[PDB]
Amino acid sequence: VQDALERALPELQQALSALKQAGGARAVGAGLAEVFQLVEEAWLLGREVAQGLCDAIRLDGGLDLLLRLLQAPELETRVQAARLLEQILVAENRDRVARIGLGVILNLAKEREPVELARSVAGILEHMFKHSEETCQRLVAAGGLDAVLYWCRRTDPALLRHCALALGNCALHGGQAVQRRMVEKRAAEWLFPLAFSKEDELLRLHACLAVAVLATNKEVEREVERSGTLALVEPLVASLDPGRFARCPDDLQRLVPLLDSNRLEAQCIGAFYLCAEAAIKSLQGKTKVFSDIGAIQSLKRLVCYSTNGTKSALAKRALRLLGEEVPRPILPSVPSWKEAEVQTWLQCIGFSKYCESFREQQVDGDLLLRLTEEELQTDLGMKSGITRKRFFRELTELKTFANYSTCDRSNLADWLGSLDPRFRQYTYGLVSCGLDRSLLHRVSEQQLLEDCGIHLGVHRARILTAAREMLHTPDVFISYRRN
Amino acid sequence: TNGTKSALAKRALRLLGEEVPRPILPSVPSWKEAEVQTWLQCIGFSKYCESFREQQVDGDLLLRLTEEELQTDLGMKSGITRKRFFRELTELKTFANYSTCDRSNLADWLGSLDPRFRQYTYGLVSCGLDRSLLHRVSEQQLLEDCGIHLGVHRARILTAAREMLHTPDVFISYRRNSGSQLASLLKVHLQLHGFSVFIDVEDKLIQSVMGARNFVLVLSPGALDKCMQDHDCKDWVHKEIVTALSCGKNIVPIIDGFEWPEPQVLPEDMQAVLTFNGIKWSHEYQEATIEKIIRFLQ
Numbered sequence: 001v002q003d004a005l006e007r008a009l010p011e012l013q014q015a016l017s018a019l020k021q022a023g024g025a026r027a028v029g030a031g032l033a034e035v036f037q038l039v040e041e042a043w044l045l046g047r048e049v050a051q052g053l054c055d056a057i058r059l060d061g062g063l064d065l066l067l068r069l070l071q072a073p074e075l076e077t078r079v080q081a082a083r084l085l086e087q088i089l090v091a092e093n094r095d096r097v098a099r100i101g102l103g104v105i106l107n108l109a110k111e112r113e114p115v116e117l118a119r120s121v122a123g124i125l126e127h128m129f130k131h132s133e134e135t136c137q138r139l140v141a142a143g144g145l146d147a148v149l150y151w152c153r154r155t156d157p158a159l160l161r162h163c164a165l166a167l168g169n170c171a172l173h174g175g176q177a178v179q180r181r182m183v184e185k186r187a188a189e190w191l192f193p194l195a196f197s198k199e200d201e202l203l204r205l206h207a208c209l210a211v212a213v214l215a216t217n218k219e220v221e222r223e224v225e226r227s228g229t230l231a232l233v234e235p236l237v238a239s240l241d242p243g244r245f246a247r248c249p250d251d252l253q254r255l256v257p258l259l260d261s262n263r264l265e266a267q268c269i270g271a272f273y274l275c276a277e278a279a280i281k282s283l284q285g286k287t288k289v290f291s292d293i294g295a296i297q298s299l300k301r302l303v304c305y306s307t308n309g310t311k312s313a314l315a316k317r318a319l320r321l322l323g324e325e326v327p328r329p330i331l332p333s334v335p336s337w338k339e340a341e342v343q344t345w346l347q348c349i350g351f352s353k354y355c356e357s358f359r360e361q362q363v364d365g366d367l368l369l370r371l372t373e374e375e376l377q378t379d380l381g382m383k384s385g386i387t388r389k390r391f392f393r394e395l396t397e398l399k400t401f402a403n404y405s406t407c408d409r410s411n412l413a414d415w416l417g418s419l420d421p422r423f424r425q426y427t428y429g430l431v432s433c434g435l436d437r438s439l440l441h442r443v444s445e446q447q448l449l450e451d452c453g454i455h456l457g458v459h460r461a462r463i464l465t466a467a468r469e470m471l472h473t474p475d476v477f478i479s480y481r482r483n
Numbered sequence: 484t485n486g487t488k489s490a491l492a493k494r495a496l497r498l499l500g501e502e503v504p505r506p507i508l509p510s511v512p513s514w515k516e517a518e519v520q521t522w523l524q525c526i527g528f529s530k531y532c533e534s535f536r537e538q539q540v541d542g543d544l545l546l547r548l549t550e551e552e553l554q555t556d557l558g559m560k561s562g563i564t565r566k567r568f569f570r571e572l573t574e575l576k577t578f579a580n581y582s583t584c585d586r587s588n589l590a591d592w593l594g595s596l597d598p599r600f601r602q603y604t605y606g607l608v609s610c611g612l613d614r615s616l617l618h619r620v621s622e623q624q625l626l627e628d629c630g631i632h633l634g635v636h637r638a639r640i641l642t643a644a645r646e647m648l649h650t651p652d653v654f655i656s657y658r659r660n661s662g663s664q665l666a667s668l669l670k671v672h673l674q675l676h677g678f679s680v681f682i683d684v685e686d687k688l689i690q691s692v693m694g695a696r697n698f699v700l701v702l703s704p705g706a707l708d709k710c711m712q713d714h715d716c717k718d719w720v721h722k723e724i725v726t727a728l729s730c731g732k733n734i735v736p737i738i739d740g741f742e743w744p745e746p747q748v749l750p751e752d753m754q755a756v757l758t759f760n761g762i763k764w765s766h767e768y769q770e771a772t773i774e775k776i777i778r779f780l781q
């Protein structure tokens with residue numbers, strides 16, 4: 001199964017021996033080109049083949065030789081060395097470059113003019129940003145991010161693709177400080193042209209992934225929206241097809257937060273990526289990765305509470321690609337729910353164990369929407385406090401997405417949402433108490449806690465203060481025939 | 484958090500007969516069940532891994548775990564064991580990525596108060612509090628909701644909070660393919676310099692041009708080829724040009740790969756605009772070209 005490696009490792013040996021023994025610039029460049037072509041041919045097969053290639057390169061100290069060729073005054077030797085570097089930056093070699101090879105790449109980032117150097121250092125910076133948080137912070141402190149922005153100012157397709165993927169990788173693996181520094185350097189504004197360029201679909205897809213990952217950081221969503229690059233995410237996702245790019249585990253674990261980001265653009269990007277990855281995995285026999293991560297539950301929750309056609313379609317396609325039953329979307333009129341709707345919501349939220357208990361109690365929309373802790377503990381047999389807290393989190397999520405028009409008279413849900421998007425869950429409690437916009441000026445804390453079910457004191461205080469501060473002969477007659 | 488320290492620790496563990504632990508993802512609020520399990524084997528609580536799995540504890544439930552839940556639901560009878568688990572949880576909460584939930588960077592404020600105060604960031608966020616809301620928080624609310632059991636920490640947080648807390652300018656006319664890159668670069672550069680520019684993606688077209696303080700059409704290679712001899716006003720770009728001419732806004736065309744069309748083949752409206760001077764676009768000096776455009780602009 002590895003005879004290719006068996007007769008390719010000696011070829012690596014003579015290639016590196018000739019490259020090291022070469023003293024002329026042209027001979028070194030030819031050796032680097034030979035190694036790069038061999039690596040490309042191995043890649044066209046082979047993940048394990050390339051891993052074996054890079055293991056031998058690291059063991060023989062080839063990357064140190066590439067570093068000192070990057071330090072060499074000759075430009076073309078540098079271009080071949082960086083061509084090899086882009087394709088030899090595997091995880092172990094990435095660790096080696098992080099530990100000793102860093103700092104040399106900043107000197108390349110100082111160079112800006114050549115297109116080949118731009119592309120090569122963009123790829124190298126992409127791989128380095130995929131390494132770890134500390135390396136991302138160090139590169140951001142250096143001129144790597146500025147180099148990425150300058151290359152984004154450029155026009156070359158491959159350079160733009162590598163820059164977009166670098167920004168996506170650094171946003172994914174950077175942390176709070178890295179994203180803050182990126183936005184302070186106007187990362188989304190320079191991401192905008194990459195997504196706007198109609199020449200290549202993959203460039204826009206990567207730029208939109210980077211924008212969505214930045215948007216998942218919701219402490220800077222204001223400036224991200226000020227950039228305005230989030231707008232193009234949804235139309236591009238709608239236009240593009242998962243199958244074409246699919247045909248063309250940690251990454252999935254990082255994409256899952258985009259699914260649970262509660263931001264429409266981020267959710268759409270995550271759904272598109274997960275659908276493509278699910279198609280790729282189902283092309284093979286290995287499909288248990290999504291189940292192990294738990295993205296199936298996220299997809300089911302996305303389908304049940306879907307509000308966008310494109311996102312719902314992508315989630316349904318991703319679920320159908322796997323061996324999971326698609327959940328039928330829930331009717332938003334929760335107060336009007338019958339027993340069957342409550343049951344269906346229960347299988348959607350993965351509480352099929354308690355479906356029979358709910359059926360025996362004959363819980364319907366009103367009883368479910370006014371369910372309390374003690375009723376769950378005693379009547380429904382939900383002994384575990386952690387399970388009860390999970391159920392109440394699911395119920396809060398349901399109450400956020402609910403149609404209260406059958407019960408709300410003063411549109412109090414809109415007022416509660418204006419106060420805070422998470423405050424809308426108390427709309428049904430406030431309505432069942434008989435309260436409306438006019439009546440909230442006289443409500444007390446004790447009444448709220450006892451009747452409206454607002455257990456959190458902070459929410460009660462905010463609602464009370466905000467309510468108190470905000471609240472204070474016909475002309476013509478018709479004479480007509482029967483028909 | 485340091486590469487050298489992590490490498491040394493991994494080498495030391497590998498020298499012995501101990502499995503190296505995979506580093507934990509700092510985004511604790513976004514943790515799934517598997518991440519909680521992995522943290523459990525890291526902190527040496529493999530006995531309770533099955534109990535955590537049965538309760539299906541995830542990032543949020545773990546990060547908001549309470550004493551009674553551990554005592555009853557998870558079967559952590561020993562108070563000493565519960566205190567050790569809470570010490571480990573505090574250590575985890577100190578090193579956590581709250582960006583998915585923190586909006587006002589309240590973790591930074593809590594850390595500025597005290598490095599050990601950052602553990603309450605998730606509680607304060609889940610309560611809905613931020614920097615602006617902390618001025619009105621009370622002791623009882625903190626104790627009941629935010630989970631700050633230590634009275635000294637509550638008093639310090641309250642006192643410290645109370646003491647500390649108290650018409651687009653330019654419109655872009657571009658072609659579908661040739662003008663897209665140049666339009667994107669122009670708009671982004673103008674926004675970087677403080678110029679508000681509205682670039683779209685008929686009735687809305689007229690209002691968009693009317694609201695534009697200045698009109699800058701992108702004369703991309705073959706930009707006016709479709710607008711050439713367009714006396715029927717079929718092209719939407721033609722509509723934009725005619726509306727801008729009717730409004731008479733400041734027009735500063737940018738020259739790239741195309742020349743001024745002959746007035747005779749063009750309608751008189753765009754015959755008028757052909758007299759305006761254009762600025763050559765340089766790929767070698769894009770920022771310099773934008774600076775020149777701004778210098779010629781207001």
Ligand SMILES: O=P(O)(O)OC[C@H]1O[C@@H]([n+]2cccc(S)c2)[C@H](O)[C@@H]1O
Pocket residue numbers: 039040043086087088089090091127130
């Ligand atoms: O997946 P990992 O090990 O984190 O990194 C991927 C590395 O493999 C190289 N590559 C992958 C595919 C095809 C070619 S030609 C090259 C990339 O340059 C990257 O450095």
